Write an enzyme that holds these catalytic residues in place. Structure first.
Site, PDB file in Angstrom:
ATOM      1  N   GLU A  20      -8.619  -7.647  13.244  1.00 20.01           N
ATOM      2  CA  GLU A  20      -8.067  -9.000  13.215  1.00 20.01           C
ATOM      3  C   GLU A  20      -9.177 -10.026  12.981  1.00 20.01           C
ATOM      4  O   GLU A  20      -9.027 -10.930  12.160  1.00 20.01           O
ATOM      5  CB  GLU A  20      -7.298  -9.297  14.506  1.00 20.01           C
ATOM      6  CG  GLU A  20      -6.082  -8.388  14.673  1.00 20.01           C
ATOM      7  CD  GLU A  20      -5.345  -8.593  15.991  1.00 20.01           C
ATOM      8  OE1 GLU A  20      -5.598  -9.609  16.676  1.00 20.01           O
ATOM      9  OE2 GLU A  20      -4.499  -7.742  16.335  1.00 20.01           O
ATOM     10  N   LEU A  41       0.795  -1.224   0.000  1.00 20.27           N
ATOM     11  CA  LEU A  41       0.000   0.000   0.000  1.00 20.27           C
ATOM     12  C   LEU A  41       0.836   1.287   0.000  1.00 20.27           C
ATOM     13  O   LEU A  41       0.446   2.308  -0.590  1.00 20.27           O
ATOM     14  CB  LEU A  41      -0.928  -0.003   1.212  1.00 20.27           C
ATOM     15  CG  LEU A  41      -1.958   1.131   1.255  1.00 20.27           C
ATOM     16  CD1 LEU A  41      -3.058   0.862   0.247  1.00 20.27           C
ATOM     17  CD2 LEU A  41      -2.525   1.287   2.662  1.00 20.27           C
ATOM     18  N   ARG A  42       1.988   1.246   0.662  1.00 17.31           N
ATOM     19  CA  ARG A  42       2.797   2.453   0.814  1.00 17.31           C
ATOM     20  C   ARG A  42       3.967   2.509  -0.161  1.00 17.31           C
ATOM     21  O   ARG A  42       5.013   3.093   0.139  1.00 17.31           O
ATOM     22  CB  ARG A  42       3.296   2.567   2.252  1.00 17.31           C
ATOM     23  CG  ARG A  42       2.130   2.695   3.228  1.00 17.31           C
ATOM     24  CD  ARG A  42       2.549   3.066   4.639  1.00 17.31           C
ATOM     25  NE  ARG A  42       1.350   3.230   5.457  1.00 17.31           N
ATOM     26  CZ  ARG A  42       0.726   4.391   5.632  1.00 17.31           C
ATOM     27  NH1 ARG A  42       1.208   5.491   5.071  1.00 17.31           N
ATOM     28  NH2 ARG A  42      -0.369   4.455   6.380  1.00 17.31           N
ATOM     29  N   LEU A  98     -12.121  -9.595  11.511  1.00 15.98           N
ATOM     30  CA  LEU A  98     -12.649  -9.471  10.163  1.00 15.98           C
ATOM     31  C   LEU A  98     -11.705 -10.098   9.139  1.00 15.98           C
ATOM     32  O   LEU A  98     -12.138 -10.778   8.210  1.00 15.98           O
ATOM     33  CB  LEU A  98     -12.879  -7.999   9.834  1.00 15.98           C
ATOM     34  CG  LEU A  98     -13.798  -7.691   8.658  1.00 15.98           C
ATOM     35  CD1 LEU A  98     -15.203  -8.223   8.942  1.00 15.98           C
ATOM     36  CD2 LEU A  98     -13.815  -6.173   8.436  1.00 15.98           C
ATOM     37  N   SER A 136      -0.228  -7.311   0.783  1.00 14.62           N
ATOM     38  CA  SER A 136      -1.077  -6.219   1.235  1.00 14.62           C
ATOM     39  C   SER A 136      -1.972  -5.783   0.077  1.00 14.62           C
ATOM     40  O   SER A 136      -2.660  -6.613  -0.534  1.00 14.62           O
ATOM     41  CB  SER A 136      -0.207  -5.072   1.756  1.00 14.62           C
ATOM     42  OG  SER A 136      -0.924  -3.854   1.848  1.00 14.62           O
ATOM     43  N   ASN A 178     -11.605  -9.765  -0.293  1.00 13.09           N
ATOM     44  CA  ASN A 178     -13.035  -9.522  -0.512  1.00 13.09           C
ATOM     45  C   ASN A 178     -13.351  -8.025  -0.428  1.00 13.09           C
ATOM     46  O   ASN A 178     -14.205  -7.614   0.364  1.00 13.09           O
ATOM     47  CB  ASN A 178     -13.854 -10.327   0.520  1.00 13.09           C
ATOM     48  CG  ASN A 178     -15.288 -10.645   0.054  1.00 13.09           C
ATOM     49  OD1 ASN A 178     -15.685 -10.375  -1.086  1.00 13.09           O
ATOM     50  ND2 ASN A 178     -16.068 -11.209   0.958  1.00 13.09           N
ATOM     51  N   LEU A 189      -9.466 -12.495   9.663  1.00 14.23           N
ATOM     52  CA  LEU A 189      -9.509 -13.951   9.815  1.00 14.23           C
ATOM     53  C   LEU A 189     -10.729 -14.548   9.102  1.00 14.23           C
ATOM     54  O   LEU A 189     -10.601 -15.511   8.344  1.00 14.23           O
ATOM     55  CB  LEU A 189      -9.528 -14.324  11.303  1.00 14.23           C
ATOM     56  CG  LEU A 189      -9.100 -15.707  11.840  1.00 14.23           C
ATOM     57  CD1 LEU A 189      -9.983 -16.130  13.012  1.00 14.23           C
ATOM     58  CD2 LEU A 189      -9.025 -16.806  10.794  1.00 14.23           C
ATOM     59  N   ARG A 190     -11.909 -13.988   9.361  1.00 15.02           N
ATOM     60  CA  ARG A 190     -13.152 -14.488   8.770  1.00 15.02           C
ATOM     61  C   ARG A 190     -13.151 -14.385   7.246  1.00 15.02           C
ATOM     62  O   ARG A 190     -13.614 -15.285   6.546  1.00 15.02           O
ATOM     63  CB  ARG A 190     -14.364 -13.715   9.318  1.00 15.02           C
ATOM     64  CG  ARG A 190     -14.911 -14.239  10.642  1.00 15.02           C
ATOM     65  CD  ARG A 190     -16.178 -13.481  11.056  1.00 15.02           C
ATOM     66  NE  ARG A 190     -15.900 -12.360  11.954  1.00 15.02           N
ATOM     67  CZ  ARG A 190     -16.295 -11.106  11.738  1.00 15.02           C
ATOM     68  NH1 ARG A 190     -16.984 -10.794  10.641  1.00 15.02           N
ATOM     69  NH2 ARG A 190     -15.999 -10.156  12.619  1.00 15.02           N
ATOM     70  N   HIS A 248       1.792 -10.118   9.479  1.00 17.51           N
ATOM     71  CA  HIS A 248       1.757  -9.302   8.261  1.00 17.51           C
ATOM     72  C   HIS A 248       3.007  -8.435   8.206  1.00 17.51           C
ATOM     73  O   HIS A 248       2.954  -7.248   8.502  1.00 17.51           O
ATOM     74  CB  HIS A 248       0.497  -8.423   8.212  1.00 17.51           C
ATOM     75  CG  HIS A 248      -0.777  -9.174   8.446  1.00 17.51           C
ATOM     76  ND1 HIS A 248      -1.225 -10.167   7.597  1.00 17.51           N
ATOM     77  CD2 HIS A 248      -1.705  -9.076   9.427  1.00 17.51           C
ATOM     78  CE1 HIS A 248      -2.371 -10.644   8.046  1.00 17.51           C
ATOM     79  NE2 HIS A 248      -2.683 -10.002   9.161  1.00 17.51           N
ATOM     80  N   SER A 249       4.134  -9.030   7.837  1.00 18.53           N
ATOM     81  CA  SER A 249       5.410  -8.320   7.873  1.00 18.53           C
ATOM     82  C   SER A 249       6.363  -8.853   6.808  1.00 18.53           C
ATOM     83  O   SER A 249       6.242 -10.001   6.370  1.00 18.53           O
ATOM     84  CB  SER A 249       6.059  -8.450   9.251  1.00 18.53           C
ATOM     85  OG  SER A 249       6.329  -9.808   9.537  1.00 18.53           O
ATOM     86  N   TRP A 250       7.315  -8.015   6.404  1.00 12.78           N
ATOM     87  CA  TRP A 250       8.246  -8.368   5.346  1.00 12.78           C
ATOM     88  C   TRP A 250       9.042  -9.660   5.592  1.00 12.78           C
ATOM     89  O   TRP A 250       9.266 -10.417   4.642  1.00 12.78           O
ATOM     90  CB  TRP A 250       9.201  -7.200   5.088  1.00 12.78           C
ATOM     91  CG  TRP A 250       8.525  -6.053   4.381  1.00 12.78           C
ATOM     92  CD1 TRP A 250       8.129  -4.866   4.928  1.00 12.78           C
ATOM     93  CD2 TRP A 250       8.152  -6.007   2.999  1.00 12.78           C
ATOM     94  NE1 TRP A 250       7.531  -4.076   3.962  1.00 12.78           N
ATOM     95  CE2 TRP A 250       7.539  -4.752   2.770  1.00 12.78           C
ATOM     96  CE3 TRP A 250       8.275  -6.908   1.931  1.00 12.78           C
ATOM     97  CZ2 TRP A 250       7.060  -4.367   1.509  1.00 12.78           C
ATOM     98  CZ3 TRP A 250       7.798  -6.526   0.674  1.00 12.78           C
ATOM     99  CH2 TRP A 250       7.202  -5.266   0.476  1.00 12.78           C
TER     100      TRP A 250
END
Ligand SMILES: *[Se]c1ccccc1C(=O)Nc1ccc(N)cc1
EC number: 2.3.1.122
Length: 283
Positions: A229, A41-42, A231, A125, A153, A233-234, A261-263
């Protein structure tokens, strides 16, 4: 951070007629088929985040595959926008689907001997879903797609709102300029979950990584970490289950209990899928 010195990494300027400018592309030639490493995203305009945070070039050096890192496109979702971002004075319209599927492969074929077909798209991401969407609509170009901590989604529920907040925090980009209001057909068109039947029909080889912990890429300072978190996961669980329910049989799913969620974990996935990609693209 970055790769060892001395690698044949080229910094190319690739003309984009659709965006009226050159797009910087970091490139390591190594075979006719390539891995497209899309940024998060960045995304910055100096280096692709894969180069900044990982030794990806090093890890795929002499893999028999070329490596392509396009540079730039903060909050773009690597898509063709309806119009310029109206919240930050963007002075052109993002046309990153056109660039990735027409302009860039045309140029790389003519100038670097890279095949426009039979490649892999790997995103994280923001570009996780991008990679799947590119495969969905351009299966000849991308028989292989990996989504690492992607938005799977984006059209559903609170996701258009959450994505809008993230895009605004990442450089003041406006999601309505991109795909319109959430009721616009562009949201479902670019929704991996919605496009699962395309992935199944094309027998796309997909590689999906789901991380744990707070998706730092954004919640937005109003929003409780636990809520996001849950949302995430689901949504991931729904994607995997729906892929199977729709006849999908060519999908590798990775959900390590320790993964974040990391490099470092995204790079571990890139390494993990190397032989998989070598087999699918090169035989
Ligand atoms: Se990617 C994911 C998200 C939510 C729930 C479960 C998963 C997942 O991939 N689980 C899984 C189970 C078994 C195997 N062999 C791989 C992955």
């Amino acid at each position: 951070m970055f790769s060892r010195p001395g690698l044949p990494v080229e910094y190319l300027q690739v003309p984009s007629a659709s965006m009226g400018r050159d797009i910087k592309v970091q490139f390591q030639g190594g075979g006719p088929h390539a891995v497209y490493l899309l940024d998060g995203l960045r995304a910055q305009d100096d280096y692709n985040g894969w180069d900044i945070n990982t030794p990806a070039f090093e890890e795929y050096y002499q893999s028999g595959l070329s490596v392509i890192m396009p540079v730039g496109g903060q909050s773009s979702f690597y898509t063709d926008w309806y119009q310029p971002s109206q919240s930050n004075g963007q002075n052109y319209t993002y046309k990153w689907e056109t660039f990735l599927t027409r302009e860039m492969p045309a140029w790389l074929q003519a100038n670097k001997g890279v095949s426009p077909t039979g490649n892999a798209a790997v995103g994280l991401s923001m570009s996780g879903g991008s990679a799947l969407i590119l495969a969905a609509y351009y299966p000849q170009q991308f028989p292989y797609a990996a989504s690492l901590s992607g938005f799977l989604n984006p059209s559903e529920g609170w996701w258009p709102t959450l994505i809008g907040l993230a895009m605004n925090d990442s450089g003041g980009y406006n999601a309505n300029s991109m795909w319109g209001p959430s009721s616009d057909p562009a949201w479902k068109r670019n929704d991996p979950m919605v496009q699962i039947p395309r992935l199944v029909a094309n027998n796309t080889r997909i590689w999906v990584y789901c991380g744990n912990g707070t998706p730092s890429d954004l919640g937005g300072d109003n929003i409780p970490a636990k809520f996001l978190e849950g949302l995430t996961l689901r949504t991931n669980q729904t994607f995997r289950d729906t892929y199977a329910a729709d006849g999908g049989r060519n999908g590798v799913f990775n959900f390590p209990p320790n993964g974040t969620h990391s490099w470092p974990y995204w790079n571990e996935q890139l390494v993990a899928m190397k032989a998989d990609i070598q087999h699918v693209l090169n035989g």
